[PDB]
Amino acid sequence: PSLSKEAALVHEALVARGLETPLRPPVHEMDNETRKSLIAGHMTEIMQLLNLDLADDSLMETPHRIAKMYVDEIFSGLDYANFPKITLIENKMKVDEMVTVRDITLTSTCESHFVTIDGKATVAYIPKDSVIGLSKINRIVQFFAQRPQVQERLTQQILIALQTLLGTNNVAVSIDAVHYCVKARGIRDATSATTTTSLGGLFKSSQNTRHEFLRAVRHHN
Amino acid sequence: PSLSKEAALVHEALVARGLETPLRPPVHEMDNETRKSLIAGHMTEIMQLLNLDLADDSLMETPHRIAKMYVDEIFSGLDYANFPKITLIENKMKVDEMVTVRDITLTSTCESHFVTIDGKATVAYIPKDSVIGLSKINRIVQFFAQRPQVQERLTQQILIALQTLLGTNNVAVSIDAVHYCVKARGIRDATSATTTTSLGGLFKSSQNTRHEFLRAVRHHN
Amino acid sequence: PSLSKEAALVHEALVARGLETPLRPPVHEMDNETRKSLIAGHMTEIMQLLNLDLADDSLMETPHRIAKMYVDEIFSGLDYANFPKITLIENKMKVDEMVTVRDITLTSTCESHFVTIDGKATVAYIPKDSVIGLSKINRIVQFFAQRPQVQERLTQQILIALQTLLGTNNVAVSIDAVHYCVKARGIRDATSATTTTSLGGLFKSSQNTRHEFLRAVRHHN
Amino acid sequence: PSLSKEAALVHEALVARGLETPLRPPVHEMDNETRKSLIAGHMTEIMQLLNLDLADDSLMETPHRIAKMYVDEIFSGLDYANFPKITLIENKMKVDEMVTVRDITLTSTCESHFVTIDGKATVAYIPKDSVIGLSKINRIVQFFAQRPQVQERLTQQILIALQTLLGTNNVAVSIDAVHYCVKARGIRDATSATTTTSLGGLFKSSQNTRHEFLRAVRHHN
Amino acid sequence: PSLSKEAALVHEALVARGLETPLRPPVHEMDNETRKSLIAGHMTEIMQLLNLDLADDSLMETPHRIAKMYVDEIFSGLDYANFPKITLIENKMKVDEMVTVRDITLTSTCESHFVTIDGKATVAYIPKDSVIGLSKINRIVQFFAQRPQVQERLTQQILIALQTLLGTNNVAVSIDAVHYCVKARGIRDATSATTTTSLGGLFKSSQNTRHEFLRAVRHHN
Amino acid sequence: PSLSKEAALVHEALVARGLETPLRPPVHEMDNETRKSLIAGHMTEIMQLLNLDLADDSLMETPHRIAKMYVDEIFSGLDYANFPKITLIENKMKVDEMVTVRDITLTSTCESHFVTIDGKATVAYIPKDSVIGLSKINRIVQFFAQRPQVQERLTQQILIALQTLLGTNNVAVSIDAVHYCVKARGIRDATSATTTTSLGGLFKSSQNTRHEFLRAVRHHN
Amino acid sequence: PSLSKEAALVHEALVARGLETPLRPPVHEMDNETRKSLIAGHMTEIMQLLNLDLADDSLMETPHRIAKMYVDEIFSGLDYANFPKITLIENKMKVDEMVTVRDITLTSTCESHFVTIDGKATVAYIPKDSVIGLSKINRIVQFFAQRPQVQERLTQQILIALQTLLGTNNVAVSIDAVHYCVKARGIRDATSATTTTSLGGLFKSSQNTRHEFLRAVRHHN
Amino acid sequence: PSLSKEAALVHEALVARGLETPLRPPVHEMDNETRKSLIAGHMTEIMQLLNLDLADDSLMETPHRIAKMYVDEIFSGLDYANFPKITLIENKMKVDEMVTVRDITLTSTCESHFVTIDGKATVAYIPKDSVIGLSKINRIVQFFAQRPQVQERLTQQILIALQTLLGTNNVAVSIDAVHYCVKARGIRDATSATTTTSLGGLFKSSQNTRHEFLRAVRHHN
Ligand SMILES: Nc1nc2c(ncn2[C@@H]2O[C@H](COP(=O)(O)OP(=O)(O)OP(=O)(O)O)[C@@H](O)[C@H]2O)c(=O)[nH]1
Ligand SMILES: Nc1nc2c(ncn2[C@@H]2O[C@H](COP(=O)(O)OP(=O)(O)OP(=O)(O)O)[C@@H](O)[C@H]2O)c(=O)[nH]1
Ligand SMILES: Nc1nc2c(ncn2[C@@H]2O[C@H](COP(=O)(O)OP(=O)(O)OP(=O)(O)O)[C@@H](O)[C@H]2O)c(=O)[nH]1
Ligand SMILES: Nc1nc2c(ncn2[C@@H]2O[C@H](COP(=O)(O)OP(=O)(O)OP(=O)(O)O)[C@@H](O)[C@H]2O)c(=O)[nH]1
Ligand SMILES: Nc1nc2c(ncn2[C@@H]2O[C@H](COP(=O)(O)OP(=O)(O)OP(=O)(O)O)[C@@H](O)[C@H]2O)c(=O)[nH]1
Ligand SMILES: Nc1nc2c(ncn2[C@@H]2O[C@H](COP(=O)(O)OP(=O)(O)OP(=O)(O)O)[C@@H](O)[C@H]2O)c(=O)[nH]1
Ligand SMILES: Nc1nc2c(ncn2[C@@H]2O[C@H](COP(=O)(O)OP(=O)(O)OP(=O)(O)O)[C@@H](O)[C@H]2O)c(=O)[nH]1
Ligand SMILES: Nc1nc2c(ncn2[C@@H]2O[C@H](COP(=O)(O)OP(=O)(O)OP(=O)(O)O)[C@@H](O)[C@H]2O)c(=O)[nH]1
């Protein structure tokens, strides 16, 4: 009937470190539909200001599609009600070596221009008492990515979230991404990409562990 | 003091073919600055509906950046004042074989979701009386690309525009593109790409010519 | 309050050609939850027959996960209530060249062993009166794929469905896939893959069009 | 007339470490044929709940094929009667440098969804008194792989089994795998892969050794 | 009404280190058009000295094109009026790990022959109190690149400029490039490329930090 | 004591077809040295106009280098005194199948901006009475490339030149190139390339021969 | 006690077609050892003319090594006593489709400069009454390759020899090679390669057969 | 009127280290033309000993071509009058990090068999007081390469020459090459290549510097 234990813990953990995405507390419990109608209205206006003919079949539904996309899709991560269900199992295997999930599909939106960020994450962790379900790592990366973002902040949030859930600081996150506000606009750099890393526990502390992780990052197909 | 001879011709040709992007005639000669301020206003409202903290340094200038992007950047192609300066030379070389410009960078926006379209175009033409300046082919592709688009329409527009400018129907246009409204959202298909082609003159009529062009399309790096 | 016009038409079209997947009409309007509890019960038994310790945290929820996966996920295409919302726009562009969507992600299950089929589809069509929304092609391929399948049948169903929706026989479908019941079991062939094609209208009729499509099939990344 | 010396030793070692796959002791010495018939029965029921027409030629033998697959194929590793015949030779060569077998085909099933796990293992060991037959390394990996698994556990099992058989703790195991329960369903991440490692003896203790092994891991074709 | 605080600061810092490109102070505030007409005249003479027929439509506008290129394009970085607008945000994320922007498109001209330098830059920095906008790193690299250059000096300039702007010495710059004065002329080495690096702060001091950066350098596509 | 028979014939043939690069007849038999001194002076002026400090060691010799480059280097192809020594052998082998030389290095300069053109040529011909020395094909391509060029013209010149020298119209020339005036400036398209072809004799006439050649063109490494 | 039946027939066929490599009949039956001593002496003189210190251990044996190489190695194909032993089997399989041996290692020496030619041959034939041993095709290519060659001639020679041996004109030979007299000297083109083909029977006559062969040529690894 | 200051110093340095290629001092100041005529004669004899028909147009000029090649081409590095003109600039940039020129085209001849050596050199140095012109590094590599060589010696020679010229011991040279006397003859190993390195100053002394260099060696295209 509310946020899960994990959603709450992770959110609290992020607020405490001052890492939460700039979001304002629920000012009014207004149904999403009203938000979507409102947003669509604004988009109708913007399109009119761009002199686009909204009468055309190809543009007619765009304001509603954009509203739905903002509220229901690309920024779904802002609502913790969409936080992934987390499942863990006892580390009976007694695994004390890192588990790495590489090339995680990452789709995000840069907050400076509200434009596509296309990337891939690599997450590693040394299991302590529990082993997390592999897909949950993918879902967590994707939860934070479905928000207007700053890559540097995104990498931190995923790290903190995982540390919190796994009960260990021994987590490492790395994200490699192409920002379309850099690529298809402005400086229009067709080839560059940005890499950001957030190292936890031994990944930070131990150069041995650190470089094992870093060496593993970016392995072509 | 107005649109170039070329911009006027191309625009006319497109209107004649019913190919123009759904744009409404200049209802009011209002300076771009007011449109940008009004659009920025709407974006501000939208971000507030999304509960984003516009007081944050990273989000504070977003509404302005987006308004500037829509009006001055990604949709610059909607304004024929931005049409490329066309330069040609006499076909003294008597070239009667196609000239092909492959892998032309193409950055566009889909009009259904106002999301990134990342593509590459391949354009070929058989010189009649004139040889067009190479970069002009790239600029024309980019001119029509910088608009809310439907890839199928975009391909048509580039073909007509080039036929008009080159004074020959023997032009062929092929665009291969990734639609982020397909890739990073909805069906979320991380691998697909869409190919559209517009064949004219001999490229449509002559199977020999047609397949020479088609075979040439898509040559890895 | 029922199936959409398109879902109905497509289903009727498939039944008429005898191409429907072997599915029995709704014998009882029993809620999915009962089906899932029933299926989970069966899976509990099977696991017990395999002497697996369902008391272990890692196996405890498997019967429920499998039930959910069968009913709600991997065979969701069996229920036309899950048929994609189809959107089309007038072919005002007057496009009379084929539109190809290549490398469509295809995830299916072979009906002989209920094992993973991992593939990619390539769909082409010559627009007649309408142009279909690009993602709808991806969603249609995926609707039929989320069913116990025989690749040869799958390719036919997608073809017929598209022809029906697009109002044209000029459609071509090609699927390239790896069957894990061939790869990870039995003959254990680690390298082979199967290609199946269903050519419609001109794709069948015209060798010119046919080979243009076939030549386009399979383009590495 | 029973399990080999090796199968017995390895099984004991695994039980000792609490590493055995959740399997219950032989409650009844019932012939595989009855289990297969009962499992096939349950699959029949499931397919009927999914409304599949079992009268169809393609679906008619499915319940039998699945029962045979579970009992005799994909889970064959659960029965130590299937343990590989181990052959070793005297380390007369006095090899005191690691021997590495890379890219070992690995086909497994995740126990959470009973779906395909497609992977590759890399195994290294420093010969003490004996040199193991190369193919035995592959067969052992495949022995534990043919079971409902948790990749983290699987890696542990292979390490212990090999240490036991080789009489040395100096063994290292690394598995890279694609989980179809992640890729073709749920989060549906088409690009990620999971890497797990189990380091023993010098591979754990000696950083020089450890990194020699880690550097060697993942060498494209 | 003059240079930005940033442009001034960067220019001062470069002059202080004796790193500025050999440029003479504004001897006369003469309008660029005069320079372009003067340069165009010199180019006209040169072409005449080469016996090129400036009457030809293809050559006629060359003197004016080269003039425009030197003054307005390829050497635009010589004028700090063209320095990029820098944006930074508070490092609230508390990022204390390097941020790397790789494969930055770099287009320069060698000062020895005024011929094309085609290259790519990799820049990394450890955020201190502020996080710079990603595109700014790209624009800065390009600002200094659009000048007659010596690759060794160019790397130094970008390093110092970034250190100045970021307020940290923890910055690293690496550039890999092809010099057409080497490739398409003289020794005509079609295969060589040159790599230069400029390490600051921890990138120079800490071998751990240094090699992390160096390892990251050059990652194919 | 003058131009070779071949140099004369080729030059004549090109003038006849109106294919010669826009060059004016020797107005004065002035030694290259004074042309170099004058060009150097104009360059010194240009650099001064750009405010470059010619006192610097790195810039001091630039004017001389650029003068030496224009006169003695990059445009050496304008002087038929540099035409390659042609050697042929009797086609005693009776070869009546095309001989193709692919991936011929081609370094040229666009005449619109006097910038680098980096490309590769593919030449094929059907030997009639004589077989040409293989390197001569490379030298001829390079002869015409070392000139201010228009790619479309360059291809034409190599075709006529070779036909003349081989005494057969059965020659085909294809050039693929990157124009730095398009890549590193203006539209700044980092990915495009231009392909031009000049087909003679059977390569023009016979579609069989034509497509054998065209298929052959562009074979990666 | 002399040349094999095949060596004789092949040599005869080549002489008839005027395809033999310029070799003079055995003027004197002088033992190879004397030729080597004479050749060695000439090389000793040459090296002295080059002022090389033959006293040095690294140069002392060179004259002998070069003599041995010319006589016994690189030009062994000049002596038909080195012709490969040919083995054929009855075409009981009734194969009437081409058999293609691709990527045959080919090492030759150009006769213009006596410098390395590195290439690969592709041979196809339609079996008539016999099927030749696969390795014999490779040995034949190498027989003719081990001679001072002209690639165009070499291709002809292999074709004729094979037709003779196989008793069919339906043979096709293609050779792709890098000539070091072009690459490491003179024009010094580091990227070009030459392709020659010799098509017989149906490969020449039938465009269907001809293009099946040509399409097959050059398949990367 | 004699050898340059650099040619002298370099030659001296090599003699001091006993690294010069086995060359005898100018016994007689005889014009190259006579050497070529003498060498040509010896080659004529050799070819006659091989029974080659020098009357043939393809072989007639070979003796002259080989003479010209030995004297004027492939062994030009033996004469210091061909030493490259060296240009350096003041290290005003204060670069104290290595500058690396990778993939330098290297064409040599092995002295054991006077056969092609195809390789690539990688040179790095830490600038002390001067920065050398980039192309000079390539010209130096090629100066020493154009001699009858021993790869191990060649690598040493380039290292010493560069240290001499740059006035620093901090130079590193690495060469990767294919010897045709190994590949196309004798053992006929078609896949092997040899790698030699010469490390000076810090490249030898500092493992940090040494491994930064080694890691940089061999970067595919
Ligand atoms: N550090 C960081 N910067 C980002 C990110 N997304 C966008 N940016 C940058 O934030 C900045 C926005 O700068 P402004 O100068 O305010 O807007 P702009 O003028 O449109 O920027 P330009 O792209 O350089 O044209 C740009 O430099 C963007 O590239 C991100 O995730 N992290
Ligand atoms: N033909 C065509 N369709 C496009 C293009 N860009 C976007 N579309 C499609 O236009 C359609 C929008 O359909 P709607 O159903 O109206 O919106 P939606 O529900 O968000 O669509 P889904 O992406 O399928 O979730 C989608 O199928 C888009 O993929 C384009 O360039 N051409
Ligand atoms: N044509 C076709 N065959 C399929 C498909 N999926 C699975 N199969 C095959 O259908 C057959 C099942 O054959 P059976 O012989 O009944 O079962 P099986 O003995 O387990 O088959 P083996 O895999 O050969 O061990 C196999 O040959 C499967 O490879 C599909 O989509 N199309
Ligand atoms: N650690 C680990 N987890 C696995 C493995 N195979 C599957 N899993 C995960 O175990 C978990 C099952 O979680 P549940 O939440 O119980 O099932 P689910 O809701 O279908 O999970 P989703 O895939 O996230 O939709 C998933 O996160 C799987 O990806 C494995 O080998 N190791
Ligand atoms: N260190 C360095 N050298 C450069 C750069 N750009 C060009 N050069 C070199 O500066 C030198 C110019 O030398 P000069 O001998 O004065 O001119 P040049 O005779 O045309 O030189 P060659 O190219 O060797 O023919 C060459 O060695 C160029 O390769 C650069 O960025 N850095
Ligand atoms: N057609 C053909 N020509 C070859 C072959 N091997 C070498 N050649 C060429 O035969 C010619 C020898 O020409 P010459 O002009 O007599 O000697 P050269 O001056 O040293 O030739 P350049 O390499 O152009 O410097 C060159 O053009 C070689 O590239 C071959 O197999 N076939
Ligand atoms: N056809 C052809 N055009 C060329 C070639 N080299 C350069 N060009 C083009 O010739 C034209 C010069 O056009 P102008 O408009 O006169 O000069 P510009 O404004 O600097 O051109 P932009 O490059 O578009 O900025 C450009 O479009 C160049 O890309 C060539 O070989 N062939
Ligand atoms: N170290 C070194 N050896 C070389 C080089 N070039 C050639 N060689 C070798 O020097 C040796 C010549 O050996 P010999 O035994 O005198 O002549 P050979 O019998 O023809 O040698 P084989 O190639 O083994 O048939 C060979 O082993 C060559 O491979 C080089 O650059 N460095």
JSON list of N, CA and C and ligand atoms in Angstrom, two decimals, chain B residues 85 87 131-136 139, chain E residues 65 68 73, chain F residues 110 112-113 117 149-152 179 181-182 185-186, ligand 7:
[
{"chain": "B", "resi": 85, "resn": "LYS", "atom": "N", "xyz": [23.69, 27.68, -49.04]},
{"chain": "B", "resi": 85, "resn": "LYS", "atom": "CA", "xyz": [24.08, 28.47, -50.20]},
{"chain": "B", "resi": 85, "resn": "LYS", "atom": "C", "xyz": [24.55, 27.42, -51.20]},
{"chain": "B", "resi": 87, "resn": "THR", "atom": "N", "xyz": [26.23, 26.04, -54.65]},
{"chain": "B", "resi": 87, "resn": "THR", "atom": "CA", "xyz": [27.21, 26.43, -55.66]},
{"chain": "B", "resi": 87, "resn": "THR", "atom": "C", "xyz": [27.37, 25.23, -56.59]},
{"chain": "B", "resi": 131, "resn": "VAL", "atom": "N", "xyz": [27.63, 20.20, -61.99]},
{"chain": "B", "resi": 131, "resn": "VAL", "atom": "CA", "xyz": [28.20, 19.38, -60.94]},
{"chain": "B", "resi": 131, "resn": "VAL", "atom": "C", "xyz": [27.99, 20.23, -59.67]},
{"chain": "B", "resi": 132, "resn": "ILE", "atom": "N", "xyz": [27.33, 19.69, -58.67]},
{"chain": "B", "resi": 132, "resn": "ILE", "atom": "CA", "xyz": [27.08, 20.43, -57.45]},
{"chain": "B", "resi": 132, "resn": "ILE", "atom": "C", "xyz": [28.29, 20.32, -56.50]},
{"chain": "B", "resi": 133, "resn": "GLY", "atom": "N", "xyz": [28.45, 21.33, -55.65]},
{"chain": "B", "resi": 133, "resn": "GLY", "atom": "CA", "xyz": [29.54, 21.33, -54.70]},
{"chain": "B", "resi": 133, "resn": "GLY", "atom": "C", "xyz": [29.24, 20.22, -53.72]},
{"chain": "B", "resi": 134, "resn": "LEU", "atom": "N", "xyz": [30.22, 19.33, -53.51]},
{"chain": "B", "resi": 134, "resn": "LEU", "atom": "CA", "xyz": [30.04, 18.19, -52.60]},
{"chain": "B", "resi": 134, "resn": "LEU", "atom": "C", "xyz": [29.39, 18.50, -51.27]},
{"chain": "B", "resi": 135, "resn": "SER", "atom": "N", "xyz": [29.92, 19.46, -50.53]},
{"chain": "B", "resi": 135, "resn": "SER", "atom": "CA", "xyz": [29.35, 19.79, -49.23]},
{"chain": "B", "resi": 135, "resn": "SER", "atom": "C", "xyz": [27.90, 20.20, -49.28]},
{"chain": "B", "resi": 136, "resn": "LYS", "atom": "N", "xyz": [27.44, 20.67, -50.44]},
{"chain": "B", "resi": 136, "resn": "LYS", "atom": "CA", "xyz": [26.05, 21.12, -50.59]},
{"chain": "B", "resi": 136, "resn": "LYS", "atom": "C", "xyz": [25.10, 19.94, -50.41]},
{"chain": "B", "resi": 139, "resn": "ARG", "atom": "N", "xyz": [24.85, 19.47, -46.69]},
{"chain": "B", "resi": 139, "resn": "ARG", "atom": "CA", "xyz": [24.05, 20.56, -46.12]},
{"chain": "B", "resi": 139, "resn": "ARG", "atom": "C", "xyz": [22.57, 20.43, -46.43]},
{"chain": "E", "resi": 65, "resn": "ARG", "atom": "N", "xyz": [37.55, 31.93, -50.80]},
{"chain": "E", "resi": 65, "resn": "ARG", "atom": "CA", "xyz": [37.28, 30.77, -49.93]},
{"chain": "E", "resi": 65, "resn": "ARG", "atom": "C", "xyz": [38.42, 30.51, -48.96]},
{"chain": "E", "resi": 68, "resn": "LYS", "atom": "N", "xyz": [38.47, 33.32, -46.35]},
{"chain": "E", "resi": 68, "resn": "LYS", "atom": "CA", "xyz": [37.40, 33.09, -45.36]},
{"chain": "E", "resi": 68, "resn": "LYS", "atom": "C", "xyz": [37.75, 31.97, -44.39]},
{"chain": "E", "resi": 73, "resn": "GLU", "atom": "N", "xyz": [37.49, 30.49, -40.22]},
{"chain": "E", "resi": 73, "resn": "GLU", "atom": "CA", "xyz": [37.31, 29.09, -39.85]},
{"chain": "E", "resi": 73, "resn": "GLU", "atom": "C", "xyz": [38.38, 28.32, -39.12]},
{"chain": "F", "resi": 110, "resn": "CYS", "atom": "N", "xyz": [41.80, 19.69, -52.98]},
{"chain": "F", "resi": 110, "resn": "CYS", "atom": "CA", "xyz": [40.61, 20.22, -53.63]},
{"chain": "F", "resi": 110, "resn": "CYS", "atom": "C", "xyz": [40.93, 21.64, -54.07]},
{"chain": "F", "resi": 112, "resn": "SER", "atom": "N", "xyz": [38.81, 24.07, -54.48]},
{"chain": "F", "resi": 112, "resn": "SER", "atom": "CA", "xyz": [37.95, 25.10, -53.94]},
{"chain": "F", "resi": 112, "resn": "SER", "atom": "C", "xyz": [38.58, 25.75, -52.68]},
{"chain": "F", "resi": 113, "resn": "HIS", "atom": "N", "xyz": [39.28, 24.97, -51.87]},
{"chain": "F", "resi": 113, "resn": "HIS", "atom": "CA", "xyz": [39.89, 25.50, -50.64]},
{"chain": "F", "resi": 113, "resn": "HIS", "atom": "C", "xyz": [41.33, 25.15, -50.47]},
{"chain": "F", "resi": 117, "resn": "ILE", "atom": "N", "xyz": [42.71, 16.06, -49.91]},
{"chain": "F", "resi": 117, "resn": "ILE", "atom": "CA", "xyz": [41.72, 15.10, -50.43]},
{"chain": "F", "resi": 117, "resn": "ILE", "atom": "C", "xyz": [42.50, 13.79, -50.19]},
{"chain": "F", "resi": 149, "resn": "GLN", "atom": "N", "xyz": [42.35, 19.91, -57.53]},
{"chain": "F", "resi": 149, "resn": "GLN", "atom": "CA", "xyz": [41.36, 19.11, -58.21]},
{"chain": "F", "resi": 149, "resn": "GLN", "atom": "C", "xyz": [39.91, 19.20, -57.86]},
{"chain": "F", "resi": 150, "resn": "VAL", "atom": "N", "xyz": [39.15, 18.54, -58.73]},
{"chain": "F", "resi": 150, "resn": "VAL", "atom": "CA", "xyz": [37.71, 18.37, -58.67]},
{"chain": "F", "resi": 150, "resn": "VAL", "atom": "C", "xyz": [37.74, 16.83, -58.89]},
{"chain": "F", "resi": 151, "resn": "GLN", "atom": "N", "xyz": [37.29, 16.07, -57.90]},
{"chain": "F", "resi": 151, "resn": "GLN", "atom": "CA", "xyz": [37.30, 14.60, -57.98]},
{"chain": "F", "resi": 151, "resn": "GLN", "atom": "C", "xyz": [36.70, 14.08, -59.27]},
{"chain": "F", "resi": 152, "resn": "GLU", "atom": "N", "xyz": [35.54, 14.61, -59.65]},
{"chain": "F", "resi": 152, "resn": "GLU", "atom": "CA", "xyz": [34.84, 14.23, -60.88]},
{"chain": "F", "resi": 152, "resn": "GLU", "atom": "C", "xyz": [35.76, 14.40, -62.10]},
{"chain": "F", "resi": 179, "resn": "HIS", "atom": "N", "xyz": [37.11, 14.42, -48.36]},
{"chain": "F", "resi": 179, "resn": "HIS", "atom": "CA", "xyz": [37.46, 15.82, -48.63]},
{"chain": "F", "resi": 179, "resn": "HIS", "atom": "C", "xyz": [37.56, 16.52, -47.30]},
{"chain": "F", "resi": 181, "resn": "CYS", "atom": "N", "xyz": [37.75, 19.55, -46.77]},
{"chain": "F", "resi": 181, "resn": "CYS", "atom": "CA", "xyz": [37.01, 20.81, -46.81]},
{"chain": "F", "resi": 181, "resn": "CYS", "atom": "C", "xyz": [35.55, 20.55, -46.40]},
{"chain": "F", "resi": 182, "resn": "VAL", "atom": "N", "xyz": [35.18, 19.27, -46.39]},
{"chain": "F", "resi": 182, "resn": "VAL", "atom": "CA", "xyz": [33.84, 18.83, -46.00]},
{"chain": "F", "resi": 182, "resn": "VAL", "atom": "C", "xyz": [33.94, 18.27, -44.57]},
{"chain": "F", "resi": 185, "resn": "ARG", "atom": "N", "xyz": [35.85, 21.12, -41.73]},
{"chain": "F", "resi": 185, "resn": "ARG", "atom": "CA", "xyz": [35.43, 22.49, -41.87]},
{"chain": "F", "resi": 185, "resn": "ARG", "atom": "C", "xyz": [34.03, 22.54, -42.47]},
{"chain": "F", "resi": 186, "resn": "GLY", "atom": "N", "xyz": [33.42, 23.72, -42.45]},
{"chain": "F", "resi": 186, "resn": "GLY", "atom": "CA", "xyz": [32.09, 23.90, -43.02]},
{"chain": "F", "resi": 186, "resn": "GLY", "atom": "C", "xyz": [31.02, 23.02, -42.41]},
{"chain": "I", "resi": 7, "resn": "LIG", "atom": "N1", "xyz": [31.98, 18.55, -56.95]},
{"chain": "I", "resi": 7, "resn": "LIG", "atom": "C1", "xyz": [33.00, 18.81, -56.14]},
{"chain": "I", "resi": 7, "resn": "LIG", "atom": "N2", "xyz": [32.86, 19.76, -55.20]},
{"chain": "I", "resi": 7, "resn": "LIG", "atom": "C2", "xyz": [33.97, 19.96, -54.44]},
{"chain": "I", "resi": 7, "resn": "LIG", "atom": "C3", "xyz": [35.16, 19.32, -54.55]},
{"chain": "I", "resi": 7, "resn": "LIG", "atom": "N3", "xyz": [36.06, 19.81, -53.59]},
{"chain": "I", "resi": 7, "resn": "LIG", "atom": "C4", "xyz": [35.33, 20.71, -52.97]},
{"chain": "I", "resi": 7, "resn": "LIG", "atom": "N4", "xyz": [34.06, 20.85, -53.43]},
{"chain": "I", "resi": 7, "resn": "LIG", "atom": "C5", "xyz": [32.94, 21.70, -53.02]},
{"chain": "I", "resi": 7, "resn": "LIG", "atom": "O1", "xyz": [32.97, 22.89, -53.81]},
{"chain": "I", "resi": 7, "resn": "LIG", "atom": "C6", "xyz": [32.20, 23.86, -52.99]},
{"chain": "I", "resi": 7, "resn": "LIG", "atom": "C7", "xyz": [32.78, 25.20, -52.63]},
{"chain": "I", "resi": 7, "resn": "LIG", "atom": "O2", "xyz": [31.58, 25.98, -52.37]},
{"chain": "I", "resi": 7, "resn": "LIG", "atom": "P1", "xyz": [31.49, 27.50, -51.95]},
{"chain": "I", "resi": 7, "resn": "LIG", "atom": "O3", "xyz": [30.08, 27.67, -51.51]},
{"chain": "I", "resi": 7, "resn": "LIG", "atom": "O4", "xyz": [32.02, 28.13, -53.17]},
{"chain": "I", "resi": 7, "resn": "LIG", "atom": "O5", "xyz": [32.47, 27.61, -50.63]},
{"chain": "I", "resi": 7, "resn": "LIG", "atom": "P2", "xyz": [32.08, 27.37, -49.14]},
{"chain": "I", "resi": 7, "resn": "LIG", "atom": "O6", "xyz": [30.99, 28.23, -48.76]},
{"chain": "I", "resi": 7, "resn": "LIG", "atom": "O7", "xyz": [33.29, 27.46, -48.35]},
{"chain": "I", "resi": 7, "resn": "LIG", "atom": "O8", "xyz": [31.42, 25.92, -49.16]},
{"chain": "I", "resi": 7, "resn": "LIG", "atom": "P3", "xyz": [30.92, 25.07, -47.85]},
{"chain": "I", "resi": 7, "resn": "LIG", "atom": "O9", "xyz": [32.03, 23.94, -47.84]},
{"chain": "I", "resi": 7, "resn": "LIG", "atom": "O10", "xyz": [29.55, 24.47, -48.09]},
{"chain": "I", "resi": 7, "resn": "LIG", "atom": "O11", "xyz": [31.09, 25.82, -46.59]},
{"chain": "I", "resi": 7, "resn": "LIG", "atom": "C8", "xyz": [31.87, 23.19, -51.69]},
{"chain": "I", "resi": 7, "resn": "LIG", "atom": "O12", "xyz": [30.51, 22.79, -51.68]},
{"chain": "I", "resi": 7, "resn": "LIG", "atom": "C9", "xyz": [32.88, 22.08, -51.58]},
{"chain": "I", "resi": 7, "resn": "LIG", "atom": "O13", "xyz": [32.52, 20.96, -50.74]},
{"chain": "I", "resi": 7, "resn": "LIG", "atom": "C10", "xyz": [35.30, 18.31, -55.56]},
{"chain": "I", "resi": 7, "resn": "LIG", "atom": "O14", "xyz": [36.24, 17.63, -55.83]},
{"chain": "I", "resi": 7, "resn": "LIG", "atom": "N5", "xyz": [34.17, 18.12, -56.32]}
]
